[PDB]
Structures are given as C-alpha cells and as structure tokens.
Design a binder for this molecule. Sequence first.
Ligand SMILES: [Cl-]
Ligand SMILES: [Cl-]
Ligand SMILES: [Cl-]
Ligand SMILES: [Cl-]
Lengths: 90, 90, 90
Amino acid sequence: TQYTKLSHQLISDVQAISSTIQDLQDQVDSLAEVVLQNRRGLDLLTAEQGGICLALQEKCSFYANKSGIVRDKIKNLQDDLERRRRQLID
Amino acid sequence: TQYTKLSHQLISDVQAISSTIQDLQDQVDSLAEVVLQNRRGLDLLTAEQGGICLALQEKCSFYANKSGIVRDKIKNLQDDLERRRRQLID
Amino acid sequence: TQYTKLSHQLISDVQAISSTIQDLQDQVDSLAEVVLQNRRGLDLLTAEQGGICLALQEKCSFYANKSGIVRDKIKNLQDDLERRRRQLID
Ligand SMILES: [Cl-]
Ligand SMILES: [Cl-]
Ligand SMILES: [Cl-]
Ligand SMILES: [Cl-]
C-alpha cells in the first residue's frame, strides 16, 4: 500500500510539474513571436542604417528556439506517466 | 526508514524544482513587461502607419500570459509539500 | 527491488525535468538578449525624447535576470542525482 502510494505521489507530482513546464514554454513561445516582430519592426525603421544592430554598432542578437525539444520531452514524459498509472492498477 | 527517506527525497526534489519554476515565471513576467513596453514604443513611432503590425504588413502578434495559472499551481503544490512534511513526522 | 526501482524512477524523472528547466532558461536568456537590444534600439531612435520610456510617458520597465540562480540550482540538483545513482549501485 505504501509503495504504490509513494509511486502514485511521484506520478502526480511529475504530472503537475510537467504541465507547468508546458505553461512556461507556451508563454516563451508567445512572447518570442512578439519579440521577433518587434525586431522586424526596428529593422524596418532603420532599414537605411542596415537594420537595428548596425544602427546600434553592436553584435547582433538572434533567438535560439528550443520549443520542439521541450514539447517532445514533456509529451514523452507524460506518455510514460500514463503507462505507469496503468501498471499500478495492473 | 527507507520509505520515509525516499518520501523525504521526493518532497525535497519537488520543492527545489518548484522554486526553479517560480524563478522562470519571475523572469518571463519581468521580460514580458519590457517586451510589451517595446511594442507600445514601436506603435508610437509608427502611429501614422497604424502601428508596427500594419507598418510591417503582417499578422499582429500579441502575448498570451499564463502567470496566474503557473503561480497558483506552484503555490498549491508547495502547500501540499508542507502538509506532506508534517505527515512524515506524524 | 521495488524501493530501488522507485528510487531509480525518481532520479530519472528529476533528471528529465531538470534538463527541461535548463532548456527554458536557455531560451529565456537567448530571448532576453534580443529584447534588451530592442530596448537599446528604441532608446536610440527616441534619444531626443530621452529614450522610449519618456517618449511613452510611462514608468520604465527593466529586466530582472535570475539566470545564475537557476543554473546553479539545476547544476547542484544534477550533481546530487549523480551521487544518488552511485549510492543505488553501492
Ligand atoms: Cl512511479
Ligand atoms: Cl522586444
Ligand atoms: Cl511524498
Ligand atoms: Cl532517490
């Protein structure tokens, strides 16, 4: 009874954590669309300067997206929790 | 002894993870304020064009905030860990 | 056999979660560089107005970075998982 209970608690905690990580990736993705449109906007406004990075005389920063990596890992983890719940009944 | 130890370890890990998720939401919220002010700034600069999205001739991106969802879930999880610690003593 | 198995599962879950949190911090850091360059860009374009916040007649938003806090916590957690794996063999 004790081992399955702690097993159940682990699955529940990991599920809750996984949904929260999804929420964070959801926000990062949403915010990133706004930020990259803002960069396109600044590049438009400074087109004659060659874009905002050249206007600033700076090394240019670009976004390194990992949305697919995170979403796959979370889905694969959630799929494993589904299997684990089943085996606790069985 | 073993079961409470693994129980203790689960609670400690989940607590540490939960604080790190809070940190991520803290940064997302902070960065989002900067990004949305940047959008207001671009919309001001291109007011005569109808704002930055129309100036870019693009579908307009807006931010989808989930801060309250995440913060509630984390607080509710931390509250449960508090109860679990108590029951391990009891 | 059961206790080490659930112990193993906890370590594996926490490891997977920790890597995903790293991914999120990686994206936040990358996106933050783009956002802060965008702010410098807007401040350049509105230099005569005193920068974008004064041009907007708004309280100015600045980014509160916690990258080092998160990365340390994750590395320290991963180091502990390494020790725990070893003790499960021993
Ligand atoms: Cl489990
Ligand atoms: Cl931005
Ligand atoms: Cl527990
Ligand atoms: Cl463990």
